[PDB]
Amino acid sequence: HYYVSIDIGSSSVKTIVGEKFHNGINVIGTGQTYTSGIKNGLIDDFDIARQAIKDTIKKASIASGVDIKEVFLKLPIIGTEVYDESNEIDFYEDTEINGSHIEKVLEGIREQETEVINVFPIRFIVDKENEVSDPKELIARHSLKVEAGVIAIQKSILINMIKCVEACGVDVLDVYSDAYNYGSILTATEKELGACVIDIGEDVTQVAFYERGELVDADSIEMAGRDITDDIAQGLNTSYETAEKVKHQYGHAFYDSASDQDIFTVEQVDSDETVQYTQKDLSDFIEARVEEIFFEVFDVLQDLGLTKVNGGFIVTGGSANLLGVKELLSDMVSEKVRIHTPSQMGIRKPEFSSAISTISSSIAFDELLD
Numbered sequence: 001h002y003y004v005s006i007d008i009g010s011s012s013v014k015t016i017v018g019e020k021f022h023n024g025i026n027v028i029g030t031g032q033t034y035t036s037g038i039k040n041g042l043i044d045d046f047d048i049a050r051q052a053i054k055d056t057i058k059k060a061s062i063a064s065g066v067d068i069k070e071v072f073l074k075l076p077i078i079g080t081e082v083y084d085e086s087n088e089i090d091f092y093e094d095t096e097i098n099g100s101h102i103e104k105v106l107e108g109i110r111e112q113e114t115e116v117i118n119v120f121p122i123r124f125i126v127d128k129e130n131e132v133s134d135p136k137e138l139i140a141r142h143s144l145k146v147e148a149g150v151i152a153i154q155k156s157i158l159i160n161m162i163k164c165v166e167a168c169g170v171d172v173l174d175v176y177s178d179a180y181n182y183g184s185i186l187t188a189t190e191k192e193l194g195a196c197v198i199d200i201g202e203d204v205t206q207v208a209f210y211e212r213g214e215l216v217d218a219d220s221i222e223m224a225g226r227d228i229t230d231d232i233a234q235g236l237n238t239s240y241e242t243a244e245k246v247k248h249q250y251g252h253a254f255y256d257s258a259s260d261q262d263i264f265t266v267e268q269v270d271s272d273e274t275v276q277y278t279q280k281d282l283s284d285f286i287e288a289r290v291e292e293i294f295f296e297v298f299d300v301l302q303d304l305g306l307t308k309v310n311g312g313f314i315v316t317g318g319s320a321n322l323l324g325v326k327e328l329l330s331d332m333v334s335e336k337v338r339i340h341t342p343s344q345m346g347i348r349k350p351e352f353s354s355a356i357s358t359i360s361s362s363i364a365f366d367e368l369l370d
């Protein structure tokens with residue numbers, strides 16, 4: 001009927017209630033609630049977080065008209081495993097492969113410390129020979145085999161993340177690693193060539209790489225928005241708060257493009273005085289940090305041995321609202337670089353990318369298995 005996804009982020013818990021249309025999703029209600037209950041993408045104070053999630057589920061339950069009781073929880077690429085696996089189910093009759101055989105054969109893969117959370121198909125193989133993308137309505141005589149991609153997350157995260165959302169009085173129908181979700185924000189062309197999604201939130205920066213249409217591998221960095229603000233507060237000798245504002249109001253991640261005529265005033269933290277800075281001044285600190293962030297990204301890529309990103313670079317997430325971000329990355333790499341923002345209205349901010357893709361993934365599996 002209705003699709004409701006929940007994004008439990010370090011800056012704000014995000015919720016989206018949507019409806020499936022022929023050419024996409026129709027957001028009919030959203031909610032957002034800032035919280036200090038989540039840090040580095042994990043629950044820092046259960047109670048505080050459990051209250052943020054409820055508030056978010058409410059603000060949306062109101063704005064959407066729907067009375068939310070079921071939700072799809074996204075999971076951060078943290079303590080996550082992305083590997084290859086296959087499985088085959090047998091037949092004793094002439095069976096017309098339907099959505100239920102897909103699930104049955106995938107379930108086997110969903111099989112110690114971790115737990116398979118997502119199993120997605122790469123290619124199926126009917127009666128031990130017909131290699132095909134879709135095996136539906138095709139007739140199987142002896143067997144249906146699937147070579148899939150699998151994602152596992154550490155049991156500690158899964159459990160508590162769900163214990164917290166379910167403590168709000170709603171059921172978690174399913175879970176979706178952002179490592180799978182980002183596939184949505186891409187284009188078929190990007191997925192094919194080898195695109196790299198860079199989601200810079202507040203505490204975490206997630207990196208996902210897709211090639212030939214499927215996810216290849218993923219990881220995260222504990223450096224993001226907050227660190228930009230931290231760098232700003234120290235550089236202008238000011239409070240975190242005012243630092244978090246001038247970043248929003250005047251932030252520019254590329255030095256060579258920040259204004260001088262643009263001036264603002266920040267108060268000092270050690271005196272009852274006030275200093276005046278230009279946008280460019282602020283830029284020095286911002287670019288520096290956003291750069292160190294991309295340098296981390298590259299390393300993640302090297303570790304995962306995922307060089308070559310002919311698919312290009314896609315950057316998103318809250319910090320993606322920063323000006324000059326596209327400029328800076330393009331200046332330190334040689335592939336296309338775009339800042340993905342949800343198309344649907346109401347959620348036309350980079351920070352909503354993950355939440356909306358969670359719904360996409362939901363719907364995607366809904367069809368695959370029916």
Ligand SMILES: Nc1ncnc2c1ncn2[C@@H]1O[C@H](COP(=O)(O)OP(=O)(O)OP(=O)(O)O)[C@@H](O)[C@H]1O
Nearest residue numbers: 009010011012201202203204225318319321322351
């Ligand atoms: N307009 C702005 N300019 C630059 N940065 C901003 C702006 N708006 C949002 N941010 C920053 O983006 C970050 C939050 O965005 P985001 O929602 O993607 O993080 P989160 O998902 O809630 O937590 P997580 O780090 O676990 O992903 C904050 O650090 C915030 O300061």
Ligand SMILES: [Mg+2]
Nearest residue numbers: 009010201354
């Ligand atoms: Mg986030």
